[PDB]
Each structure stands twice: as structure tokens, then as C-alpha cells.
């Protein structure tokens, strides 16, 4: 739910600063989610996992 919304925006690009501006000033809170998010799909980091949700690995848009 929470890791789905972020992983959703993250997939479409959204480091943290943006997430904090979208979700709310809580880059820290995300840090906790980022970890869980990875332990959900089983990746590594938000960056690596970001591509997971992407499933393209282009980084063009």
C-alpha cells in the first residue's frame, strides 16, 4: 500500500526530495519504506528497485 504508492511514483521517477514534496516532508520516513520496499520485491536500493518497478532500464523520460 505504502510501498506501492512510492514504488509507483518512484518507478516514474522520484528520488526522495520529490517524494517528500509529493508524499510529505519526510525523506526519513521514506528511508524506512525504501528498505521495506526492497524487502518486498527483493532488490537492493530504491534506485535498483526503481528499475524493478520500471522493468525497462531506459531512463529517458
Describe this structure as you would to a colleague.
- With 61 residues, the protein is mainly α.
- The chain has one domain (1-61): Arc Repressor Mutant, subunit A (Orthogonal Bundle).
- Helices cover 66% and strands 0% of the residues.
- The protein is built from 4 helices and no strands.
- Helix 1 crosses helix 3 and helix 1 (2-11) crosses helix 4 (46-54).
- The radius of gyration is 11 Å and the shape is globular.
- The protein starts with a helix and ends in a 7-residue tail after the last helix.
- It is classed as dna binding protein.
- Keywords: DNA Binding Protein, Structural Genomics, PSI-2, Protein Structure Initiative, Integrated Center for Structure and Function Innovation, isfi.
- The assembly is monomeric.
- The entry is titled "SSRB DNA Binding Protein".
What's the quick description here?
This protein is mostly helical and 61 residues long. The chain is 66% helix and 0% strand.
CATH A-level architecture: Orthogonal Bundle
Secondary-structure element string: HHHH
What fraction, in percent, of the residue positions are helical?
Answer: 55-70%
Q: Label the structural class.
A: mainly alpha
CATH topology: Arc Repressor Mutant, subunit A
User: Separation of termini?
Assistant: 25 Å
- Rg, nearest Å: 11 Å
The total beta strand count reads 0
Amino acid at each position: 500500500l505504502r510501498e506501492r504508492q512510492v514504488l509507483k511514483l518512484i518507478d516514474e521517477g522520484y528520488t526522495n526530495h520529490g517524494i517528500s514534496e509529493k508524499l510529505h516532508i519526510s525523506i526519513k520516513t521514506v528511508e524506512t519504506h525504501r528498505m521495506n520496499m526492497m524487502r518486498k520485491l527483493q532488490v537492493h536500493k530504491v534506485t535498483e528497485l526503481l528499475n524493478c518497478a520500471r522493468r525497462m532500464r531506459l531512463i529517458e523520460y
